[PDB]
Amino acid sequence: DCKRKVYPNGSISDYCEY
Numbered sequence: 001d002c003k004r005k006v007y008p009n010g011s012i013s014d015y016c017e018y
Contacts, residue, residue, distance in 0.1 A: 002016035 005013045007013060
């Protein structure tokens with residue numbers, strides 16, 4: 001139950017909060 005966070009730079013972050 002996680003969702004990749006999209007940044008304004010145009011890249012995605014591979015870190016989800018548990």
